[PDB]
Amino acid sequence: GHMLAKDNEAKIFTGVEGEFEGIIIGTEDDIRIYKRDELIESKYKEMCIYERQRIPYNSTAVLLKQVLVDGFEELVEVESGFMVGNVHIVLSGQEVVLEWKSSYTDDVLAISISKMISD
Amino acid sequence: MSDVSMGMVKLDKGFDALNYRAIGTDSVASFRGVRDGDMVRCIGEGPRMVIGHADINEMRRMIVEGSMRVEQEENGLLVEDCVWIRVSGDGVTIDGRDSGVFYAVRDVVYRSSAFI
């Protein structure tokens, strides 16, 4: 440790003054800032991660909605499945396909989905 | 100093309150700020967003570090004869139809990403 510069000094090269929404990257060697709007163009970028979990199920789509309602607040039914929060739930035979976002909250309620279909 | 852009600036104390996470050896955080002079100041709270660097080669290597066999193809990585990792321009898709490996792959990708 202790291999940094001034703790209030950083190196930023994008998009400078004017208001900017940015990100800070600090390594064991260097502290640097990029502007978020500019950042998508760099080797570093905002990434949406879709993670799909296929869950064995013995009940019907109507029953899934019912079980989801038991735990959930916001359950919305859609033409091609169910959507809880930002989680896409679709029943496919005797398995449910769970696809959900990178986002912290989206995993948590999605976890609740998984237990609903599980047992 | 503003030849390329700016370079060395002063970080405001507000950044110390930001949600820092560390990718690999780097530490990352998101913030909303106003830039005035040599001073960088936060005016808001960085939205909660995964940032990182997606390399198919690096992810594969790290997966193998978990003692998992990975196959390299155009579509991405096939781990343990079932995990699907697919790369999109602004994101990544992981397929859970693996037998008890999903958690491992989720760990690997998050080693190259961070919730900020």
Domains of chain A: 1-46 (no CATH), 51-118 (3.30.310)
Both tokens of residue B14? 């507000």
- B8-21 burial, b at 16+ Cβ within 10 Å, e below that, comes to ebebbeebeebeeb
Rounded CA separation A32/A21 (Å): 14
Method: NMR
Q: What is the DSSP string of B58-104?
A: HHHHHHHTTT--EEEETTEEEETT--EEEEETTEEEEE--SSS-HHH
What is the number of residues in chain A?
119
Q: Are A14 and A7 in contact (CB under 8 A)?
A: no
Both tokens of residue A119? 């047992």
* Residue A99 phi, psi (nearest 5): -125, 130
Instruction: Please answer yes or no on whether B28 and A23 come within 8 Å at the CB atom.
Output: yes
How many residue pairs bridge chain A and chain B with CB atoms within 8 Å of each other?
140
Contacts of B8 in chain A (CB under 8 A): 5, 9-11
User: Which helix H or strand E contains A114, and what residues bound it?
Assistant: helix A104-118
**First-to-final CA distance of chain B:** 29
Cα Rg, chain A, nearest whole Å: 21
Would you say the C-alpha torsion A32, A35, A39, A44 has a positive or negative sign? positive
Distance from CA of A96 to the nearest CA of B (A): 11
Contacts of A13 in chain B (CB under 8 A): 4-7
Contacts of A11 in chain B (CB under 8 A): 7-9
Rounded CA separation A98/A24 (Å): 33
What is the number of residues in chain B?
116
Distance from CA of B70 to the nearest CA of A (A): 18
Contacts of A54 in chain B (CB under 8 A): 96-97
Both tokens of residue B115? 């919730």
Give me the residue spans of the domains in chain B: 10-45, 50-115
Q: Are B113 and A49 in contact (CB under 8 A)?
A: yes
Q: Which member of A8, A28, A46 has the closest CB to residue B10?
A: A8
Instruction: Please answer yes or no on whether A52 and B5 come within 8 Å at the CB atom.
Output: no
